[PDB]
Amino acid sequence: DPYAKLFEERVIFLGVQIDDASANDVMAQLLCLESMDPDRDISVYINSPGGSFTALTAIYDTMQYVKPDVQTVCMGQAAAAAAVLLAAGTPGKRMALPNARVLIHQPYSETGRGQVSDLEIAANEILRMRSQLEDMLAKHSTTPVEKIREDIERDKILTAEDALSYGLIDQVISTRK
């Protein structure tokens, strides 16, 4: 089992869309690896589309909560919440593969039927979620907040070099040679 060996060294691999179960698994893996050694470096590999915002916040807090450094590697794609997870790595060691792409846009939500007051409360919650996502993207990047407001209005697609110029990643790795 290759995944067994990858987790055995330091590697947590995130290749499925972000929902509650996957977030719980990632959190458990991070806590276990921190329990093994609170001074080594954990690696997180992102090849997933977006997902629920609550799971995104849970994983973000979990990475920001432990001592061990988190090295984010983008591969294939990292869209929506996965982009924030990629940008949430410790500075200087957030990297992406040459042909990877990063997609960012504002959260999409769908509430059930309900009275007007319930919809107003839900709308306030959604707006504060969007503002919080904006703040997270601004904190971990070199781009000012207003430019992020302009960018996340619609779908924004960035290449590896474009992401590096944006400040989401620090290095684009080509080959081991």
Added chain:
Amino acid sequence: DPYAKLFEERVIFLGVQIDDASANDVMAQLLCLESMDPDRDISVYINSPGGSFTALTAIYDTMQYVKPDVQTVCMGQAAAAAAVLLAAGTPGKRMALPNARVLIHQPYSETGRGQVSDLEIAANEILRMRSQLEDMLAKHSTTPVEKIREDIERDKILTAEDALSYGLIDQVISTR
């Protein structure tokens, strides 16, 4: 698996919805943890979007029964019953991660078609359940019962600082 080793540490994880099966697993784990060592604390991580009321009562009673102090940490979210579980930890140990939320609202339920007497019995039971939830939230927090009664009338979303000012938690951790 990471869950087994986390259990070996002394951490119970509750990231799934609250039903009979999850409550049974949590109660069994709590009993085993108390049996192995009745002095060291038990950590419970909450990431659940609420669930059934009976399972909530069972888990709450089991938590209050055990000798070891139960430290409840909220990460991701804690909605409805999960809020009660988070606030039900031993005082001085309840804590939450920085940008998490706690959502509280009155119970929601539905019943099948039946005569008026059965519907009346069900309505009395649901009112009793809401009152019991009110008392549980009141005694384990700071705000008076009247404000909570006026507050859970609609959905109430509290951030970490809002929960701390509310009294549901005790201190917000950024890093361990």
Added chain:
Amino acid sequence: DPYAKLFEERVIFLGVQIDDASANDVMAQLLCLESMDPDRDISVYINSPGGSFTALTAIYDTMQYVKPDVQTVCMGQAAAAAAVLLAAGTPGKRMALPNARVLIHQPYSETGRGQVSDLEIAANEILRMRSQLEDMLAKHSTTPVEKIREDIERDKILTAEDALSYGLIDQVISTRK
């Protein structure tokens, strides 16, 4: 089981549709084999009918990144993205069975409901992806990019000898004397 024995002999076997899970499995196996021995060759066997483009890019980047040489063996068929994996092996170590076949054609995509602007960004992304695929085919073959552009307009079917003349493979297996 035979698959474990093949993996012990540094053979990664790919006979399933290229999606996120299969790509993740292939990437993990490649990383494990590279870690176990960074000098011996790794064999990849292709019997897949194609799949998504993101998994294609991820697998291609990983198989280019590792330091050991990668030998691609086509058999049965190698269609669309799989064909690229057949042509992305190290030069002189790409081969196919006598009766195998190869499919090459431009990407097919589908977008749901959306406003005109979102469809505009989506179409721009699809065109960029098709151009990237054209460049990938041009780099690893012996054919000018204009000829590839004209060829991949519709489905093109290449036999083993046609693939050999096209430059996608280096030699055709005949038998073990």
Added chain:
Amino acid sequence: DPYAKLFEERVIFLGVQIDDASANDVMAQLLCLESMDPDRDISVYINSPGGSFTALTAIYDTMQYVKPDVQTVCMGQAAAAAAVLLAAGTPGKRMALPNARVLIHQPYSETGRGQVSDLEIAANEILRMRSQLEDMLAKHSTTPVEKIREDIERDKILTAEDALSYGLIDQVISTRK
């Protein structure tokens, strides 16, 4: 389990339809058996009702590539692709049970909706596939190719003795006495 015991004795069952997974398992077993011993015969037992053409191609090529002789035994039935696999055994080592039947017919196919050019390409490919199949049948049998072309127009059912007289097999085994 009996299947592992027969595998230890260099015996392979093919008792399900010919698809990608079945072909992959069969060829992996063939390669492992060749690597275990390169001069002992390998037995293949056929009880399949047919399958996909590309998987048939891959299995046939793998059978022709391996060094050891391959002995094919048709037990219950061998229809369409299974007949070609049965006839593709090492000459003089092809057998069938007395109450066995072999069914041969031209390939069947269906295509989704598309423009006329795509349909023309698909029709050309299907004609090529039929030509390849009848070439394979003519190569491994004692029947002129035009006779096979005339015969495989419709379903043709052959008993064990009929298959022997057709050249598909070599012996019919009654009892061990």
Added chain:
Amino acid sequence: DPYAKLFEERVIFLGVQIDDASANDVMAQLLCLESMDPDRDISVYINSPGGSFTALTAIYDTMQYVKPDVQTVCMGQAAAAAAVLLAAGTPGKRMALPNARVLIHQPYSETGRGQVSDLEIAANEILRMRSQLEDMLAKHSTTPVEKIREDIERDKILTAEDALSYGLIDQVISTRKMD
């Protein structure tokens, strides 16, 4: 695990529908049992309702091929192909439980839509299949083939002693204590 334990003393259950997987498992077990010891009997227990015909012929050929004697025991019901398999045992070693039943009838078939030539070919194949079934039943019993043809027109249901007089089985076993 009881099934492996009976397999240790050379006993095989055929208690499911007769299809490709069941036939393959049965012949694999038969070949393994022959390889282990070529001169000790093999017991086959039949509790199946029937199945396909190609699997029937494959199992029948495998039973006839192996050197050791095959003793067939009917336990519950043995219908259609199961009746042929029960009658295909070594003569004098075919048994049935006292309240067992054996059902024999001509093959049933169904084909998809097609041109008339394909339908004619399929019908000829089905008639050949029925003739093969008739020959198989006539060979392993003491009844003239004409009576077989008359009988298998519709569902012919036989009890234990009716099958014994009919020639399909050789013995009816009541209890162990009574030998």
Added chain:
Amino acid sequence: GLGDQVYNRLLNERIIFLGQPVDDDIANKITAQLLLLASDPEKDIYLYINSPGGSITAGMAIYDTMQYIKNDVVTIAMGLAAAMGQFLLSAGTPGKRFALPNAEILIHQPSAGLAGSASDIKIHAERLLHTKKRMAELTSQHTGQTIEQITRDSDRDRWFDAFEAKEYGLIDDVMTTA
């Protein structure tokens, strides 16, 4: 087909049918027919209820129309008159309620279902109590029975033939071969 012509030719003789469970559409049809027939204030209207009840609101629409048109309404129970069908049967003008000799009559309490939050469930439970009490009060008013007798009898179910219903007070007389 033939149903339209037969129903129209019967309506020309002031006869109305209720041979199906009562809901919004049939309630609208019955109300419209009653209003149309109310053009003549002198002649009376015949009703031929045989149905297993239905919704309360449609039943009260029909009932309010019955007590408003100033015309005498004659109700006849033919098949099964249950739940709200019994209510509409007993809602006719006094002395003009009849049942065929082989009819069945059923009385029981209303039924419904609840869904929502605690507050909405509470409000709907109070409304269900109020409507059940109104049902019992109206039934006790139309029949010669006390409110306590009705609320005790309609706890689960109660079946009547023609003569038992006559003695109870649900109907006025059993009509045969008339």
Added chain:
Amino acid sequence: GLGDQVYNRLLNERIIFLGQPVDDDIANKITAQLLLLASDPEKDIYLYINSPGGSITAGMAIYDTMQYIKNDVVTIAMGLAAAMGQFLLSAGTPGKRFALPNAEILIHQPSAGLAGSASDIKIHAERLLHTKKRMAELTSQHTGQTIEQITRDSDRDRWFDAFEAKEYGLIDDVMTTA
């Protein structure tokens, strides 16, 4: 549709059909036709039966309507008359019930499953037994074959053809060419 014109022209001849299983709608339509034809008080109505039966209440409503009008209803059975079909077949005016020669008649006890709570199940079981007894008494009255004999015969399905029905008492004569 041809059915509409043929049914209209047949009803103009005082002929009614019952060619489908009895339910609420066909019972309502047949009752409407009977009441409409009851305007003429000295003519007779011919009713043809070809049906496998239906609900008890609808059949009893049709039976009550047949018994209520002063007109004599001549019943003719063609095809088959089973369960409620034969009950309405035998409900015709005495001396005026007929069956075509190749017609079958079937008799059996009622069957209607019911479920709920224990008390509701008990009440509904009592009601079912009461309806079974009423069915037996009515068919005994209409055939004159005592109650115990009918109860013994109706335990399972029993079949009759023309002459057996005539001698048993279900019908009165077997019609041939008029």
Added chain:
Amino acid sequence: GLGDQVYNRLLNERIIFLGQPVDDDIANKITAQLLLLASDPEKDIYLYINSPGGSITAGMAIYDTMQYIKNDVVTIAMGLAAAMGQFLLSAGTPGKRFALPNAEILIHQPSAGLAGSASDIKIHAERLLHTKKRMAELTSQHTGQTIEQITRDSDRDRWFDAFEAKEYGLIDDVMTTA
């Protein structure tokens, strides 16, 4: 069916029905009938309400047509006037709003759903708030109560019988006989 001719004669008598939930089709139908009857600018138009509510836009279209045709509209609650139904019932011309004695009325705030990106949710939330405010203001204007009174009384479901509605201001009088 017969319902078409019954409704046609009722329309000839200047009577309109709304015995079903409000949607685009029934709103177009009611508006068409109102426009057709507005040819005579002297006579009145009677409209019966029996509905559990419907879409806001359709009800507002009906209300605008009622206020536009300069003819008096007499509204009658006939069993249930909920949500938009009670709004249309109170929308009648002053002094010509009535309810039957056994009629149920209720009031509550509108309900809807949200889906889309953040900006779309924002805009639709603003528009829902605005339309809720307009509904409250229109109810306050028609009933004569205070805007805050209606806002506080419509947070949850609130029920009314005929007399409580009359004293509240939803209707003006309760018809009993004529």
Added chain:
Amino acid sequence: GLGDQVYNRLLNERIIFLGQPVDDDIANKITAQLLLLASDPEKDIYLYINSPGGSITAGMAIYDTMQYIKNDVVTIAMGLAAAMGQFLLSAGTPGKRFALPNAEILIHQPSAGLAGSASDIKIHAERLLHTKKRMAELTSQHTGQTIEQITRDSDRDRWFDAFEAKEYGLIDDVMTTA
């Protein structure tokens, strides 16, 4: 039954309705009605809109038929007029566009989907951009606003009411009473 008669009478006077989503069959029906009423060139035609939008091509066909005839078409918003409903509402003859006091008006860019190979996606993309540009140009022409302002406001899902539409230029007056 009644609806067909009412619509027939309304069309007989001068009136046309569009109270449903815009698609092929309703577009053909409205085009046929416009062509049929175009026999007399002196009189004008009144059209009412209560619609949440629809397909682009059907709306453009209706618009072209509206402009083709020399008759004057007076468009009246009658509830919700969104997307293509707004486009057809503003397409009336200048000085003859109206909205009732409680009417909702919405403007937004078209929406569609994409599927197929890269070249087909490309071609469909230029076609969608071209039709969006044409819609913006036509809206700017009819409303008197600048094309840039129309694009800015129609990118997102701006709402309106009667008076905001009047000041914007989508309509010419707010119609109240006759």
Added chain:
Amino acid sequence: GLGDQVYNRLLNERIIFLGQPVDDDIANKITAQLLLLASDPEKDIYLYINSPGGSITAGMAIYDTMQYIKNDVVTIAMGLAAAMGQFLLSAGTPGKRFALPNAEILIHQPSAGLAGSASDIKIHAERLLHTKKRMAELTSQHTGQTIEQITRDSDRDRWFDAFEAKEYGLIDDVMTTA
């Protein structure tokens, strides 16, 4: 109801509609209408096309019927008029083909599917190729372009507005007002 009457009154003026996708049913209807209108040797027939295309053989039947009769057929394109709709639009009497200004036009090659054995697939392939060649030849003959030009252009989807279609030769003139 109303749509059928409007279509009949339009047919009385020799106007034919070709909305909705073309299939066997609408092809039979159009052929029947053309044959019925052909009773007048010397008049004109107007055809409106708003269809996205459909069956090749049904369009061929319509085209042959159009060419068969002596009457001049004037085709007017409104809406989409794509695929076989375009072909039937271009097949009108020369000098009598028109399109409304805001009318799209699309041209592309036919599409189908393949299933069966190798021989049947082959035969169907030659038949499809022959059909495509015949379509190209007919388009070239009617539009006045060259066969190679038509084949090269109609490989993928190709779009025209009114004026590009006029220049290309698909239509003759663009109608703005009668």
Added chain:
Amino acid sequence: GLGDQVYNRLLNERIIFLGQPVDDDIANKITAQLLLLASDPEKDIYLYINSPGGSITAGMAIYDTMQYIKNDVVTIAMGLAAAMGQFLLSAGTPGKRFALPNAEILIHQPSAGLAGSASDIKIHAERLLHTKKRMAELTSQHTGQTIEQITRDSDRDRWFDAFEAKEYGLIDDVMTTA
């Protein structure tokens, strides 16, 4: 409704249609129309064919009715005449079978399925072979080609245009104009 009226008018003139696959209902309708039109034994009856075939027994009933009456039947193929559409196309009276210039004609052997026991399959296969032989014999008799030639040709699908069918003997002439 318009389709029914135009079909009635065409049937009034002389025209009959087969624009849909052949089955029991359509065969019954065409037999009815032919029997009704047979009242005049002088004037000829025109029959247009556009269908992909259908059931064998129904089409042979149509063919028998065609061959049974004394009137002359002129068959006209348009759009498509495949399988038994061709068979009924070739069944017309000699010298009176026509096809439109862009009409396609298909010939192939029948098809069916088998299910049951061995003996039932045997019987069904025998009668399928008999039906195929009868089809080939009738085709040879009507067209003029030999039986063996027809058998060789109708082993797979074969397609014809107008002129190949004319020379082959399937039709008598190609009709271009009137």
